[PDB]
Amino acid sequence: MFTGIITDIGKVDRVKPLNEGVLLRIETAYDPETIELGASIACSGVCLTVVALPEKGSNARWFEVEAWEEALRLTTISSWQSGRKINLERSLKLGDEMGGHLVFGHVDGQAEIVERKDEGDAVRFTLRAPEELAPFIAQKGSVALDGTSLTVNGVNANEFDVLLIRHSLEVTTWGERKAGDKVNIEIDQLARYAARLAQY
Amino acid sequence: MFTGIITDIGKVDRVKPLNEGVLLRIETAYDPETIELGASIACSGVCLTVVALPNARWFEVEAWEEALRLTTISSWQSGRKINLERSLKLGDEMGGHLVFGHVDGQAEIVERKDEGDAVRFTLRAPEELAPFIAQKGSVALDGTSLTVNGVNANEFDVLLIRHSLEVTTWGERKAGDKVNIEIDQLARYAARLAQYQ
Amino acid sequence: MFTGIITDIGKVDRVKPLNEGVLLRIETAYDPETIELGASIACSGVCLTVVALPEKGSNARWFEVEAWEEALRLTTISSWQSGRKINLERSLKLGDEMGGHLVFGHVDGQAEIVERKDEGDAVRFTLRAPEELAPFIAQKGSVALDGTSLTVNGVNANEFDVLLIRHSLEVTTWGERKAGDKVNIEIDQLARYAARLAQ
Ligand SMILES: Cc1cc2nc3c(=O)[nH]c(=O)nc-3n(C[C@H](O)[C@H](O)[C@H](O)CO)c2cc1N(C)C
Ligand SMILES: Cc1cc2nc3c(=O)[nH]c(=O)nc-3n(C[C@H](O)[C@H](O)[C@H](O)CO)c2cc1N(C)C
Ligand SMILES: Cc1cc2nc3c(=O)[nH]c(=O)nc-3n(C[C@H](O)[C@H](O)[C@H](O)CO)c2cc1N(C)C
Ligand SMILES: Cc1cc2nc3c(=O)[nH]c(=O)nc-3n(C[C@H](O)[C@H](O)[C@H](O)CO)c2cc1N(C)C
């Protein structure tokens, strides 16, 4: 589990073809001596499992994950090539506060940035989502976009706004985001369960 | 508490009947020196208390009435492989979701489909547990933290990644097999808020 | 941080009014040599900072803590007089086992015991939760009551049930608890999260 507070911008260094999947080697600022095999790392919102790390005597910092059909088809990972910059977050540890918005890394789908506008040193992103996700995108609600926890600023039908502050633009991949880009979206877990209850 | 990330495949070595319960000796890769009496270990999702310990690597647990009735443990015999997870220690990563090891019942695998080196399992849960199973929500099946990828009534599908197929008992699971299901406790919190309102 | 496994039953030795607070001296079975000034100890669920220990040469076993406006208002501490027995738990370190659940020692309020019923192996305590906390107390969830890690066995409107096993009655202050008694309540992490999103 995660909070949607991005702590590193990883870079996809190597892409290798697997049997209906891909092997991703992701360069990171994280110390590999703090990562265990089988650990969960959120990669632009997608929870992925570490399968390989550098040898103990290596100076290089990276981790390897394997993305399979579900992650490939639903998330932006299908378009990830060598050089791609991604948001990274380590898993919450027992003892850590849960905060105001839990992110689990099971991405619901994708939203498209349809407009990008500067507002001082901040940037307003207008996005469109699939109809199915619209009931979950609510005013003042929290949502994870590319693994980044963000407040829904304005909403118009299937379109909604998020306001990204200068700091968030610097430490995440959001600074390079352009109109037309796809981002991973994860709705709130509590709202998800509340809605599933309501249909009964 | 647990997180649904399996760290060992244990083997049931001894099964001894008791008064309204069973005694189980599980062979494990866990170091007995790291285990104390009274410790909680999730055995294929079922939270059981260690009652007996030994260089030999094993622990003993007792499954009572509720556990034997609700879970797959009633079918556990010598030779059976089970998923194992240690209780979270302070500072341990909660890589899945919050898993408590109170199994709500049994789910039956209705379909196993190969997806390259990953495997899609379609399962059928009890009707009572269906409202707690949401699309792209979490579930613990045989103690494994998994995303519900699609849901249709009481039927749902999960995808088992290569790594998990290697380090868990899921690699040998087939259609017809029953698994332990713990619904997300967070879904129970949602139900409580809806009940109050 | 704490887990809700009580390791000593302390006795409130003295209570002294302070400027906007109260000083408490608590008699303990803990070795004062293993306690440092500034250490966190859960006192019937309430996380408190050690402000004083016995002097050099002294063989006495006590520690002093100070309770401020929030602790005095929200918790049972305002009622603590000399002789009062309280649950004690030491703060855990990185890598320590967590046999209860995650307990921060930030008490949310007071729950009142309404019923105590002996059921052989365990004693069933029925409690009334504060109105604000009740919607976030759910079956199978964990609760810290007087710092004791307990499972919510069932919920009935503003009331809920907990089961206390014989060992817990022996090692905690729950052995002397009766109907009408107010206990400290801290809801677990999922409950706290649900309470945060609703408010
Ligand atoms: C609930 C919540 C909402 C947030 N909303 C926003 C937001 O609307 N805009 C923004 O630039 N940054 C945000 N943030 C902060 C960003 O998530 C972080 O700055 C980035 O992940 C980089 O660490 C929010 C954080 C939150 N936490 C408490 C879970
Ligand atoms: C703990 C955890 C680990 C996961 N590891 C992987 C993984 O290693 N490869 C993969 O393709 N998909 C994974 N997934 C599933 C992907 O995150 C989802 O398929 C995408 O987010 C799309 O929903 C994992 C999920 C997990 N839980 C927490 C949600
Ligand atoms: C900490 C803990 C220890 C438990 N130990 C045992 C146990 O030792 N034997 C047993 O039959 N059932 C147990 N249980 C209850 C079993 O996990 C449940 O009966 C089964 O999962 C079926 O719901 C324990 C439960 C616990 N928490 C989660 C409340
Ligand atoms: C590390 C820590 C130390 C604390 N020390 C004290 C303290 O020394 N006195 C006090 O009145 N309240 C305290 N508090 C706050 C009290 O525990 C809360 O006011 C009560 O539990 C009521 O919420 C401390 C809290 C702490 N963390 C866990 C949050």
Side-chain angles (χ1 to χ4, degrees), chain A residues 189-191 193-194 197, chain B residues 185-195, chain C residues 138 194:
Chain A
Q189 181 89 311
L190 201 57
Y193 291 133
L197 264 18
Chain B
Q185 179 63 30
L186 195 48
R188 194 170 273 113
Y189 275 102
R192 171 62 186 164
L193 190 61
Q195 185 199 20

Side-chain angles (χ1 to χ4, degrees), chain A residues 40 46-49 66-68 70-71 74-75 104-108, chain B residues 5 95-96 136 145 147 149 161:
Chain A
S40 295
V46 191
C47 192
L48 264 7
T49 303
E66 300 177 338
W68 303 102
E70 181 68 20
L74 200 65
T75 79
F104 290 88
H106 44 52
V107 170
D108 289 279
Chain B
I5 302 297
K136 289 295 166 175
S145 179
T147 304
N149 294 327
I161 60 173

Side-chain angles (χ1 to χ4, degrees), chain C residues 23-28 32 35-39 41 48-55 60-66:
Chain C
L23 177 70
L24 305 163
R25 184 174 292 196
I26 302 159
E27 191 85 4
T28 182
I35 313 170
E36 300 298 321
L37 295 172
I41 298 172
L48 257 21
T49 305
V50 177
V51 301
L53 295 160
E55 67 186 58
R61 291 200 174 191
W62 55 262
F63 64 91
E64 280 179 354
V65 291
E66 298 168 339

